[PDB]
Amino acid sequence: AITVNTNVTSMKAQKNLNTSNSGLSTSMERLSSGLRINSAKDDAAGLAISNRLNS
Amino acid sequence: AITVNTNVTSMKAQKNLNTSNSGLSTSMERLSSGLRINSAKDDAAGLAISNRLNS
Amino acid sequence: AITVNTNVTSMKAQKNLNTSNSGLSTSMERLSSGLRINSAKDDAAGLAISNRLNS
Amino acid sequence: NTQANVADAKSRIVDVDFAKETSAMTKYQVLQQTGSAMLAQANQLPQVALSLLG
Amino acid sequence: NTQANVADAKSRIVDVDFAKETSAMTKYQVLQQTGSAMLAQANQLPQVALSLLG
Amino acid sequence: QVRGLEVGMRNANDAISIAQIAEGAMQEQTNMLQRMRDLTIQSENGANSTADLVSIKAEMDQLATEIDSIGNSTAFGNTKLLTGTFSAGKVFQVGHQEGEDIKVTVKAS
Amino acid sequence: QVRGLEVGMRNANDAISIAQIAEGAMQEQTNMLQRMRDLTIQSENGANSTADLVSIKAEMDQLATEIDSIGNSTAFGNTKLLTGTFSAGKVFQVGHQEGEDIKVTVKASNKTSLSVGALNNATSANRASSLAKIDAAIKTIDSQRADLGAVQNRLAHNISNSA
Amino acid sequence: QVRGLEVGMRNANDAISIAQIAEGAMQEQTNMLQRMRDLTIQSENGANSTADLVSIKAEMDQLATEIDSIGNSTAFGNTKLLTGTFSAGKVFQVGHQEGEDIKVTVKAS
Amino acid sequence: NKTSLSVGALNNATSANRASSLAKIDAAIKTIDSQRADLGAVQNRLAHNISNSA
Numbered sequence: 001a002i003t004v005n006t007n008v009t010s011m012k013a014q015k016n017l018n019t020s021n022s023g024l025s026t027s028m029e030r031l032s033s034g035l036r037i038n039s040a041k042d043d044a045a046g047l048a049i050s051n052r053l054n055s
Numbered sequence: 056a057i058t059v060n061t062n063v064t065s066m067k068a069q070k071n072l073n074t075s076n077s078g079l080s081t082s083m084e085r086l087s088s089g090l091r092i093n094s095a096k097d098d099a100a101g102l103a104i105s106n107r108l109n110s
Numbered sequence: 111a112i113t114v115n116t117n118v119t120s121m122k123a124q125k126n127l128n129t130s131n132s133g134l135s136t137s138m139e140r141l142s143s144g145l146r147i148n149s150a151k152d153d154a155a156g157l158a159i160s161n162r163l164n165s
Numbered sequence: 166n167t168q169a170n171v172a173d174a175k176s177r178i179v180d181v182d183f184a185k186e187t188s189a190m191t192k193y194q195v196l197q198q199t200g201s202a203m204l205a206q207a208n209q210l211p212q213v214a215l216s217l218l219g
Numbered sequence: 220n221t222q223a224n225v226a227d228a229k230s231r232i233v234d235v236d237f238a239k240e241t242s243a244m245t246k247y248q249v250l251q252q253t254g255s256a257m258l259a260q261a262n263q264l265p266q267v268a269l270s271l272l273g
Numbered sequence: 274q275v276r277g278l279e280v281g282m283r284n285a286n287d288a289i290s291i292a293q294i295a296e297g298a299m300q301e302q303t304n305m306l307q308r309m310r311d312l313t314i315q316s317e318n319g320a321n322s323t324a325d326l327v328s329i330k331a332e333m334d335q336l337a338t339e340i341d342s343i344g345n346s347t348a349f350g351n352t353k354l355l356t357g358t359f360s361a362g363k364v365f366q367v368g369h370q371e372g373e374d375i376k377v378t379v380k381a382s
Numbered sequence: 383q384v385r386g387l388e389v390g391m392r393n394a395n396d397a398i399s400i401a402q403i404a405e406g407a408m409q410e411q412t413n414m415l416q417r418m419r420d421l422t423i424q425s426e427n428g429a430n431s432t433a434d435l436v437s438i439k440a441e442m443d444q445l446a447t448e449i450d451s452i453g454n455s456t457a458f459g460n461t462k463l464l465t466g467t468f469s470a471g472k473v474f475q476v477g478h479q480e481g482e483d484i485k486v487t488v489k490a491s492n493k494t495s496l497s498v499g500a501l502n503n504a505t506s507a508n509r510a511s512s513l514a515k516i517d518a519a520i521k522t523i524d525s526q527r528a529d530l531g532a533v534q535n536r537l538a539h540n541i542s543n544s545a
Numbered sequence: 546q547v548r549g550l551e552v553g554m555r556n557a558n559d560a561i562s563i564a565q566i567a568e569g570a571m572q573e574q575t576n577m578l579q580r581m582r583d584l585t586i587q588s589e590n591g592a593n594s595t596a597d598l599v600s601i602k603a604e605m606d607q608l609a610t611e612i613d614s615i616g617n618s619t620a621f622g623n624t625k626l627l628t629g630t631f632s633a634g635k636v637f638q639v640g641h642q643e644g645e646d647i648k649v650t651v652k653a654s
Numbered sequence: 655n656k657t658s659l660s661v662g663a664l665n666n667a668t669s670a671n672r673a674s675s676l677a678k679i680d681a682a683i684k685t686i687d688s689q690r691a692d693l694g695a696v697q698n699r700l701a702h703n704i705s706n707s708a
Contacts, residue, residue: 001073002237004195006230007188009080011223014184016087045315045329059249062242069238095296106303110310114214119207125545127200134193140181141190147179150405150531155587155601156178158524161412163175165419165520216255218262220297221347228290228349231283364669371673383622477618521596528600532607539611543573 277369288365288377295354295379298347302382305336344382357381386478387544394537397474397486401534404463404488407456408523411491414445415519418501422513425503435503442501446493453492466490476540484540486533489526496522549641560637560649567626567651570619574654577608616654629653659685 029038037047084093092102139148147157316329344355352358362378425438453464461467471487493499496519502508588601616627624630634650656662659682665671 001076003230003234004192004199004237005234006226007192008223008227008230009083010188011226012084013087014188015220015223016084017184043315044332045321045325048325048328049321059246059253062246065242069242072238094293109307112214114211117207117211119210120204123200123204123207127197127204130193130196130200134190134197137186137190137193141183141186144181145179146181149402150527151534152531153178153587154528154531154604155593155597157527158597158600159593160175160179161520161524163171163178164416165517213251213255216252217259220301221294224290224294224297225349227293228287231286231290371676383620479618482614482618525596525600528603532604535604536607536611539573539577540614543570543615 274369281367281369281373284365285367285375288375291349291354292377294347294349298343298355299382302340302343305340309333309336354379355382383478390476390478390482391541391544393474394476394484394540397484398534398537400458400463401486401530401537403456403458405527405530407452407464408491408527411449411452412520412523414449415516415523418442418445419513419516422503422509422516426509439501439503442503446498446501449496449498450493453490453495463488464491476537476544484533484537486530488530491523491526546641553639553641553645556637557639557647560647563621563626564649566619566621570615570627571654574612574615577612581605581608626651627654 030036037043037050040047085091092098092105095102140146147153147160150157312329312333316326345353347353347355357380359377359379360381362376364374364376366374368374421438421442425435454462456462456464466489468486468488469490471485473483473485475483477483489495497515498519501512501515503512584601584605588598617625619625619627629652631649631651632653634648636646636648638646640646660678661682664675664678666675
């Protein structure tokens with residue numbers, strides 16, 4: 001099991017780093033503005049309710 | 056006992072290297088993510104219990 | 111099959127070394143600049159789309 | 166707002182991922198040293214002909 | 220996820236194991252030098268006929 | 274026996290890969306099912322309205338579509354593994370004689 | 383066949399280099415055309431004046447001169463590659479027999495070709511007409527680069543097969 | 546028999562070389578066909594445009610030209626091997642008597 | 655030859671097809687093995703006649 005053409009250990013390691021980087025990014029923008037529902041990624045029903053409360 | 060057709064010493068040596076390489080690989084992915092139960096290789100009952108605790 | 115005029119083993123070995131050297135070279139220039147599409151070797155449609163996005 | 170989102174779209178197309186690129190760069194370095202040892206050793210194959218009396 | 224697992228399956232079929240290959244390469248190098256010495260020495264077997272007066 | 278085992282070794286490495294891919298796909302189905310549980314709990318507010326419940330359903334509806342989509346896509350090169358063709362376990366031979374077989378069963382999901 | 387292929391290999395390495403140089407020059411023409419787009423957008427303020435518009439044109443005017451200058455300079459030793467001598471694709475032979483040829487076509491690309499050279503920004507209609515021609519210019523260069531990239535992707539596979 | 550076999554040995558070494566060259570050429574046709582698959586998958590974006598699809602076709606078009614070019618070029622000295630002259634397998638004699646023949650068939654590609 | 659050794663029709667489609675094919679190949683190796691032993695005994699036998707006759 002000693003190969004020099006594919007490194008599956010690297011492939012799994014790369015995915016974990018991408019997930020941790022994306023989580024760090026989304027936390028900064030929530031902190032920089034102060035809103036949990038920045039986009040429609042988050043609670044779909046929350047933004048609809050908030051719009052009527054804003055009115 | 057001097058042969059030039061089979062090297063059983065190599066055969067035993069190869070197996071030990073494969074085991075040590077596989078153990079090194081599995082330790083890195085546990086460290087890169089932070090979860091002991093990555094797949095169903097590990098505790099079969101642990102993942103089932105964790106799913107209800109996650110709920 | 112013992113010849114001293116042609117070494118086909120060398121011919122096959124030479125080709126493999128050339129492929130590995132060319133792959134190493136192209137990886138360094140992508141890393142030294144930071145762009146996947148350096149020239150038109152790569153995605154032909156990608157550079158066209160990027161030009162309008164750049165505009 | 167729209168400027169930031171277009172920058173997202175443009176980077177996914179033209180920009181490299183260092184995780185992808187670094188693995189490939191190290192990937193080929195090993196193959197180069199493997200290729201050089203194989204080629205040097207394959208070059209002295211015809212010296213067997215000298216063993217059978219010139 | 221599925222890309223990584225398919226890469227596992229594909230390498231077990233087409234990729235070499237250097238532990239297996241290196242042993243075989245050294246395995247045949249010895250046989251070559253053994254074969255060359257045996258062939259060179261077997262070539263001068265008929266010189267016995269010269270001992271019995273031409 | 275020596276050559277028989279060597280082919281048998283590769284026979285079992287193939288079975289490991291099939292079980293590896295199917296297990297990976299079921300993990301993603303589990304995460305989306307957990308999100309459906311939260312939406313059902315969230316859909317039980319008494320402060321919601323008729324229009325609010327429709328928006329939550331429009332989210333649940335698309336999550337169920339992917340559970341279908343993963344089920345019909347997960348394949349080993351060209352063989353679909355989660356659509357019932359492994360309902361009655363298939364057979365891999367890991368020895369050098371008849372009867373040395375391992376059975377892998379994957380029910381449709 | 384053995385010696386025929388060896389000469390054919392060097393024949394195709396030459397074609398790769400020609401396509402490499404032409405592609406490199408068109409990249410710099412693209413960047414200067416993008417700067418002309420910004421100046422046209424910048425030249426549309428209502429707070430500018432007649433003297434202000436002249437200064438912006440004096441910048442656009444010199445950028446168009448270099449698009450001419452690159453077009454007339456880019457050469458392979460002594461053969462100009464962007465002045466239309468490759469308008470009807472030239473031929474390289476990559477095999478050892480007749481008919482094994484590859485054709486490389488490079489259309490002329492300079493300021494008169496790309497319909498630039500007279501670009502004003504005084505009146506309302508003048509700026510609208512100028513913006514369309516620059517956009518059409520980028521499209522023409524983009525298609526040319528794709529055509530040259532396909533050939534050198536094509537040529538790379540011949541070398542591997544011939545080896 | 547001794548001299549008959551010696552000529553028969555060289556007769557079969559010739560057949561090996563012909564099969565070796567044809568196999569090598571088909572490998573390069575396989576790699577270019579794989580690249581055409583990616584372009585077809587890439588050509589299915591909904592963010593593309595009419596002008597974008599034309600550029601992708603201009604690439605697919607030249608790759609198909611080389612599949613023609615390899616097919617019409619691959620030869621053993623002066624005999625083309627992939628243009629159907631080996632559609633009905635040719636014959637090599639590897640023994641010292643009549644009827645000891647091997648047939649090699651290469652369909653046009 | 656192939657008809658003698660009960661080979662010439664070997665399929666591998668169904669479950670029963672592969673099981674039947676495996677048994678016939680194993681029986682084929684046994685038959686050849688016994689034949690080689692019979693021929694070896696004769697030439698061991700013939701070698702002793704020559705020495706005695708000399």
